[PDB]
């Protein structure tokens with residue numbers, strides 16, 4: 001299997017052909033052009049690879065996902081948010097947010113300048129979005145991802161101050177479900193993501209949901225840059 | 232005659248009182264704010280002016296239009312599309328399409344940073360849409376415009392590869408016709424648009440349709456980003 005892409009085509013092989021180990025490895029090569037990424041997200045595929053390696057494309061089985069309404073907020077966090085010291089915005093500083101996720105030397109080490117430029121293009125074309133957390137005038141956290149109708153693909157999140165991440169995710173979810181949102185894609189289940197309510201589901205089911213929710217929509221102004229939470 | 236708009240009011244004068252030559256010159260000034268732009272379209276007025284000049288608003292008589300079903304496709308163009316090398320999408324890259332038209336260097340030269348931002352806002356707001364044509368991984372054409380119910384005002388289109396904009400309009404028309412689309416506004420006829428089957432009707436007639444179709448409605452999700460046609 002494992003198809004090798006090229007500049008001559010933006011089409012990917014079927015997700016069902018992905019490898020078992022590593023989980024979901026479907027293709028390598030191509031580029032991070034706006035059209036190829038959209039095609040990918042449209043088919044439940046996403047790019048991830050370490051700096052120095054060719055572009056690797058995935059669609060694991062199972063797929064880690066998060067039902068907005070199932071977001072788990074600790075009793076402590078709720079008390080924290082009740083008197084939150086942060087304010088949350090939407091699409092105010094995408095560059096800073098993705099650069100925030102990049103600078104942390106962990107899972108975000110895969111975010112190279114090439115990746116940053118690629119997603120900043122999707123954000124400029126209106127498909128990639130960011131939620132920003134502010135402490136005074138400083139960005140202390142947030143998250144970003146690619147929208148797919150009523151489905152949201154969460155690429156990553158970062159935090160430079162206690163409870164910043166949870167805040168962005170807490171408020172976003174309220175906003176999301178409040179206006180039609182139905183699902184958040186987390187790709188691969190991990191400890192932190194699992195502690196927040198993320199659960200695994202068969203890839204085939206994820207695909208069902210995806211081509212089902214990508215043709216849906218949220219209010220015309222749902223992604224317009226604005227303030228989301230401010231006491 | 233012809234009025235100076237004000238940053239104060241977002242209202243327009245009766246299109247029927249426009250000049251004959253230059254055809255349709257109705258007003259000047261104002262700004263390109265969403266509210267005002269959206270209002271002009273509602274009234275069958277559109278902005279057009281060269282860099283350096285003040286905003287100019289127009290409503291020509293006659294008006295150029297295109298009945299979707301009457302789109303003319305040559306026999307060799309059908310042969311081409313039958314085995315098409317292009318991919319067509321909706322709202323995948325409005326900014327790139329508009330910049331593509333601005334780069335035309337013929338008359339896309341009126342499209343300044345200001346005009347681009349103004350139409351970008353209407354896109355952000357969901358009133359302006361684009362149709363992209365891809366060849367492999369490259370954007371080779373497309374068109375963008377403002378939706379007005381079952382009426383669509385085609386602002387402009389561009390081509391970087393043979394038959395690109397024709398397949399853009401061909402695929403769009405099929406999509407548009409299939410879900411309730413009634414008319415495409417072309418503003419002012421030009422050899423190319425004329426070969427595609429566009430024609431001229433009296434301004435009072437166009438306005439008549441406009442006021443009828445702006446009430447019409449297409450599927451609630453007609454404009455969400457998606458692929459409309461995939462090559463083979």
Ligand SMILES: CC(C)C[C@H](N)C(=O)O
Pocket residue numbers: 143154155156157184185186187188193
């Ligand atoms: C919303 C989150 C699931 C985003 C990203 N997948 C992460 O693990 O941080």
Ligand SMILES: CC(C)C[C@H](N)C(=O)O
Pocket residue numbers: 297374385386387388400415416417418419421424
């Ligand atoms: C897109 C076309 C059908 C209309 C546009 N005004 C043009 O002449 O390019």
